[PDB]
Write a protein that binds this ligand. Structure first.
Ligand SMILES: Cc1cn([C@@H]2O[C@H](CO)[C@@H](O)[C@H]2O)c(=O)[nH]c1=O
Ligand SMILES: Cc1cn([C@@H]2O[C@H](CO)[C@@H](O)[C@H]2O)c(=O)[nH]c1=O
Ligand SMILES: Cc1cn([C@@H]2O[C@H](CO)[C@@H](O)[C@H]2O)c(=O)[nH]c1=O
Ligand SMILES: Cc1cn([C@@H]2O[C@H](CO)[C@@H](O)[C@H]2O)c(=O)[nH]c1=O
Ligand SMILES: O=S(=O)(O)CCN1CCN(CCS(=O)(=O)O)CC1
Ligand SMILES: O=S(=O)(O)CCN1CCN(CCS(=O)(=O)O)CC1
Ligand SMILES: [Ca+2]
Ligand SMILES: [Ca+2]
Ligand SMILES: [Ca+2]
Ligand SMILES: [Ca+2]
Ligand SMILES: [Mg+2]
Ligand SMILES: [Mg+2]
Ligand SMILES: [Mg+2]
Ligand SMILES: [Mg+2]
Ligand code: NI
Ligand code: NI
Lengths: 346, 338, 338, 346
């Protein structure tokens, strides 16, 4: 039984890997991809999502929506377009760009071209899916969560029928872009704060706690090559170059011998949650902090001290680690998908 | 010579008067009304806008959109009619179909969504030669949401609002006014967006626009020869909160707020204007929604101007305002009849 | 029948008038003056307090303490005299020894430390039958610092202050008054401490206490027969900021703030009083120091009262105030002579 | 050459160990001890400091001051005295209490008894020491830093002649009592914020980053016993019981097999700084955060990225780790002191 889902993301090298996993996994039935602002503008993340789909021969099959350009109440941190940063550095996209098929979203919306795309386009599609869902509809989110916050402001009564599985936050280790907070939260902390208060069933499936243990080592690289290079050496090198585009920065700035892979871990949670530990708690997102906005603050310590003197209700599930065998299961899943993509590319 | 505009509001007795003025004024060509959350839910403010239109025989002419139910990042203050003082049961049951439904291709009102108005506003903004005029007299959540979806449209929008207090204190909170403090982040966003923003009717002005005995007698004189029923309805609505204004707020005669903003679009020559930088307080625990300006620092001598503020009506302005309102009420009375 | 008290202030022309009133009034028995930071450094406010005392022939009688140089957790706004309008060179060079030095066992003023006043105040608080009275007319940093060192003394202190604005807007910032906004955490601490706190002279009152032509002529009549030199000094000091008050703040005639707080201790029957909960804004970016009350919620109907607020002088109060001030100025004039 | 210093602390089991190290080390010449509010009231921390001194036969030699009872602008987190918590649980102090000699501070101040002690008593003594110092005067701080903040408000011109060595903060790991902040900072973040802005030469000598690696293991316990029990078995058991009083809480709540020892690490920095790594940076203390007040936020990442595009001047030294051999050097120092104390007790 396949699980219908939507992907909300900001590709982004990590997000590209997540899309690949979600789309090629037979267990996930991707209905649409919506893109958000991030390190680059939402127009660039839109193009990068479509680049990903076209590379894997699915750009004619999956509608892609271009979402909101900035946070709810804060400024974008996106580079100016005059920096000339694609957001998917490391490879030449010129062939993928020029062979790009028509976006199926355009026909859904009755638009003639992509210049008509508006941030709230995805709303009606998501509402159809939420309404049709027997229990809850599954959204995988691996960038800022502005798009989902905007949706819930327009459709508050849908919150109770949405399940979110995200790459976001840090709990028992420190942050990345800021001392104690993670990029996806700190770029729009009000958005995640809204979502947690809305009635959404929210899982922090892939915080830094987990993703910093999911490292692209030499062993992983050789496993990738073994699975892909017999079928498409060109795809092999593309995927390696993308995985290692920020390897120097991770090493020199962040002390990483081998770089982490974040976003696909969230999709893996929807595919195979048995590999993850889970704990329910109350998560407060810092919004007032001058230096600490986006911190994910929990009552986990108070639960381990004095369980039934706890005031605030649980509003989230947090996955703090993978179980034994979980890392191997994750890499086997990713390698399988990359192998299948390699076969289709040829 | 008419000015195309949209009304964003939360009726509300004040907003009802503003709708009447804007719609019946030949100078303002109302394209649509969007409603927002306030003291009452956005579903109630929606119905109240439609009640107003149907009372004045325009519910078949003007599309009404139902907007956002809560602030961007704060909780609603809406309670479980919003237009007390009269019986709306006949107006409700004779209500014609909302023209917005045909614009949207909807079969019924349950399909209305908060972002419905977006495409209509964008068409109007795109078609405008200079800027398109929006009159806003409730929370500004709807416009903030619009600008998040259409950021490039900010530079082609002109906003005329009833909002804020500057040289006097607030109403619902010590130093802030209801429309701002209910969603301060919204107005903060708008001021930063590139919108041409005028605080046309802060409390500074509206607390001098008072429904006195003289005003009531002028209303009666203009309306009661044509529709005694409308006369009493409008008086009952104007005085629904008179005791609360007296006992809570020290008002001998109650203020009328929102129509003053529409009057600014009709006849701005009656208003004083000053340009300044307005900072909206969002971090304050007790002072969120305060409109803080650099007006004092300008009179002594950094931050660029982001708004126009109208601090008073000029001599003759109050009389001009009441003459305009009474004229419109007179015309409505004629259309309603006995 | 006299009331023992201490003055905490930042002279300042207003504070100078307050010192004069408190010291020469037979109803107030001034034990000491402590000075605080303000527009000028605490070292300058110290000298200005001593200048005031020496002008009125009391610098040998009243110990003056030099208090804290900056707010608890914010930066000073002090610039690199603080009593412009007159030449103090003679008053400075004839300055007698500060009696505080002998109380402290110090040889010279360079040994003065901000916490020097603490032991003296504690002796007074301990000896008080009920509560000891402090008049405060600058930042309240000194008293906040005292209460951090002597928390158990809070319940035996009564504070009468010039501070805040409630039903009108602020001065130096849009919605807040100078004395609060310079150290809002200090007043926040004090209100939470158990001190019996009265906002005796907010802007609400002091902006109605105006140095008009009539006042100036009453001053001249009372002083100039005894000391024409003192007459001109006091007028020049009262009108040093008259142009700025007019041009910046719209004042035809300038206000006199701080002495109104001392007048409250002398004759409280001239003031209206209301009890409420005051929250001091500390988190606001543009609104820190706002005095936010539950007065509106009380007139509609949770948080316990923590202050008394005087919102107006009663009929006759302004005349009683000016009669008291002019009497004191007359007595000072007599002691100075020609 | 001995280094004159003052100790500001809130004993506290950790603080007790720090006092022992500082007082019995010949390299540190302790001038006075000032106590602050913490988990218990400042009156209890005062008594606990005097208990420590009397146990080690120094209560007649070192003046102890009782400092401020609460933070600058926040409420105390001290238990009510009706909880009946000493603040030095694990041993019976009744003999130490009744043999307590007169506090030398009383004669310095001209007081007849301890009930006359006031929070600002230490000010004049510290100012004498700061004035006499050739370069800067050294303060070791291992609780809330309210006392030093209060001092600097009264003596702002002394800031430039004070060097502070503290146990405080967490940088590259998460907090203890709150998700991302450490107890000593979060109890009065405004105090440390004031100090960093004042011109004090400030070293975070012992953040959790270090102290969570300084663990009282079985090996340590046996080394203690070997050094002390031949001279005073009673002292041996006292010190062990104190070191392990919170062992269960550390294990069950915080995942510690063996418990950390915090405060003495700060004194060890003044004794032997060569065992510590140092980095200069700008530290911002979060004061506005609702859930994150007391977070120590640094520009260390921006230094490793783009050194000479840094705006804010350095205001602190941070010690992020001990060098190789540092842990062993620390334990050798502590064991030596405990051995010497054992010999004096007999
Ligand atoms: C290396 C890198 C990562 N990311 C995103 O950060 C999130 C984790 O903090 C991931 O979703 C990744 O896509 C970016 O947005 N930009 C980058 O240059
Ligand atoms: C008396 C009153 C006023 N208002 C709105 O407050 C704004 C002024 O602060 C106006 O737009 C008015 O509609 C309400 O929403 N409800 C009321 O009961
Ligand atoms: C005009 C003026 C007033 N003040 C103080 O502001 C307070 C009122 O907000 C008074 O205590 C007055 O001393 C000053 O400190 N400096 C000034 O130049
Ligand atoms: C176990 C424990 C430790 N502490 C203090 O926490 C600081 C580190 O966060 C140390 O200075 C320790 O004294 C306390 O104040 N109370 C305790 O119960
Ligand atoms: O009553 S008022 O004069 O204020 C507004 C009436 N006005 C005229 C009719 N349409 C224009 C034609 S269409 O472009 O909307 O179809 C908008 C509404
Ligand atoms: O000029 S005023 O009347 O306002 C204050 C004069 N007052 C009398 C003298 N001492 C009391 C004796 S002692 O207790 O201070 O020594 C305090 C000062
Ligand atoms: Ca991402
Ligand atoms: Ca309204
Ligand atoms: Ca003053
Ligand atoms: Ca400690
Ligand atoms: Mg799939
Ligand atoms: Mg019209
Ligand atoms: Mg007197
Ligand atoms: Mg020693
Ligand atoms: Ni860039
Ligand atoms: Ni307790």
């Amino acid at each position: 039984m396949s699980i219908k889902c939507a992907l909300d993301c900001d590709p982004g090298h990590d997000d590209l890997a997540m899309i690949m996993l979600a789309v090629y996994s037979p267990k996930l039935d991707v209905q649409y991809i919506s893109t958000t602002h991030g390190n680059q503008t939402v127009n660039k993340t839109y193009q990068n999502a479509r680049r990903t789909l076209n590379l894997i021969k699915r750009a004619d099959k999956i509608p892609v929506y271009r979402g909101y350009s900035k946070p709810l109440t804060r400024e974008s941190v996106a580079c100016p377009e005059i920096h000339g940063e694609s957001g998917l550095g490391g490879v030449d996209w010129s062939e993928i760009d020029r062979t790009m098929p028509r976006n199926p979203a355009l026909d859904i919306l009755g638009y003639k071209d992509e210049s008509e795309l508006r941030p709230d386009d995805f709303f009606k599609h998501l509402h159809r899916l939420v309404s049709a869902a027997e229990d809850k509809f599954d959204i995988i989110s691996t960038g800022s969560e502005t798009n989902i916050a905007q949706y819930l402001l327009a459709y508050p009564e849908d919150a109770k029928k949405i399940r979110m599985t995200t790459m976001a936050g840090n709990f028992m280790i420190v942050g990345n872009i800021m001392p104690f907070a993670e990029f996806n939260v700190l770029i729009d902390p009000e958005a995640i704060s809204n979502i947690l208060q809305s009635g959404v069933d929210y899982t922090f499936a892939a915080p830094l706690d987990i993703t910093h243990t999911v490292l692209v080592t030499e062993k992983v690289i050789n496993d990738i090559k073994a699975a892909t290079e017999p079928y498409s050496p060109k795809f092999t090198e593309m995927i390696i170059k993308l995985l290692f585009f920020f390897k120097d920065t991770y090493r020199d700035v962040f002390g990483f011998i081998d770089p982490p892979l974040h976003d696909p871990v969230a999709a893996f949670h929807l595919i195979a949650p048995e590999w993850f530990e889970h704990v329910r708690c109350h998560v407060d997102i810092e919004t007032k902090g001058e230096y600490t906005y986006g911190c994910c603050c929990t009552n986990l310590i108070l639960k381990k001290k004095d369980p039934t003197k706890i005031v605030k209700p649980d509003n989230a599930t947090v996955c703090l680690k993978l179980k034994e065998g979980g890392h191997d299961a994750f890499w086997n899943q990713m390698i399988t998908v990359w192998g299948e993509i390699a076969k289709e590319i040829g």
